[PDB]
From TrEMBL:
Gene transcribed to yield this protein: scaB
GO cellular component: extracellular region
UniProt superkingdom: Bacteria
Descriptive protein name: Cellulosomal scaffoldin adaptor protein B
Organism: Acetivibrio cellulolyticus
Keywords: Calcium, Metal-binding, Repeat, Secreted
GO biological process: polysaccharide catabolic process
Subcellular location: Secreted
GO MF terms held by the record: carbohydrate binding; hydrolase activity, hydrolyzing O-glycosyl compounds; metal ion binding
Keyword Kinase: no
Length: 190
């Protein structure tokens, strides 16, 4: 199956791949086996005219300085995680970064965090239309691997050994052939 694999990687999961206007999909970022991982930065693209980015708890729409919702990793108090977001929501662009900060302490623990969610962002369907959400490079992340930078408990960019898996698509996947056959059009004239 999809995600029935053994590699190292970052991806984004959806809570559901179909949604009606006004409802919200939970977009979760998660990594798989990233050795001695300790922090992330990512950059994401969506159709702003088709999706509105909101908090998944509060349903309040993001400001282009909004914090992502935390996943399982990078939320241990011991190691001093610190987070921040910076976006151009006008342009359907999001940049998020969270990282432990007491790395020596982290290293002492001799138990690294390598698999599991990282951040959670919510998208309110404006329009019932095929869109995609993708990690994509930015000028502000020259060293980025497809929108994505990752670190380890030394403070060193992990620049080899994993790849980036785009989340897929949202809504319309017609492809079918059922039975809706009448002519009930409205609409106006005179």
């Amino acid at each position: 199956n999809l995600d029935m694999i053994k590699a190292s990687y970052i991806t984004m999961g959806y809570d559901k791949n179909a949604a009606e206007v006004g409802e919200i999909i939970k977009a979760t970022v998660k990594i798989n086996k990233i050795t001695n991982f300790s922090g992330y930065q990512v950059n994401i693209k969506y159709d702003p005219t088709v999706l509105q980015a909101v908090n998944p708890k509060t349903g309040v729409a993001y400001t282009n300085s909004s914090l992502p919702t935390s996943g399982e990793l990078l939320v241990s108090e011991d190691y001093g995680p610190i987070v921040q977001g910076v976006h151009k929501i006008s342009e359907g662009i999001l940049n998020l970064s969270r990282s432990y900060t007491a790395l020596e302490v982290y290293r002492a623990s001799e138990s690294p965090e390598e698999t599991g969610t990282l951040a959670v962002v919510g998208f309110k369907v404006l329009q019932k239309k095929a869109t995609t959400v993708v990690f994509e490079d930015s000028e502000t992340m020259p060293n980025g691997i497809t929108g994505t930078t990752l670190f380890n408990w030394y403070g060193n960019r992990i620049q080899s050994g994993y790849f980036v898996i785009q989340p897929g698509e949202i809504n319309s996947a017609p492809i079918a052939t059922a039975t809706p056959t009448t002519k009930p059009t409205a609409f106006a004239s005179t």
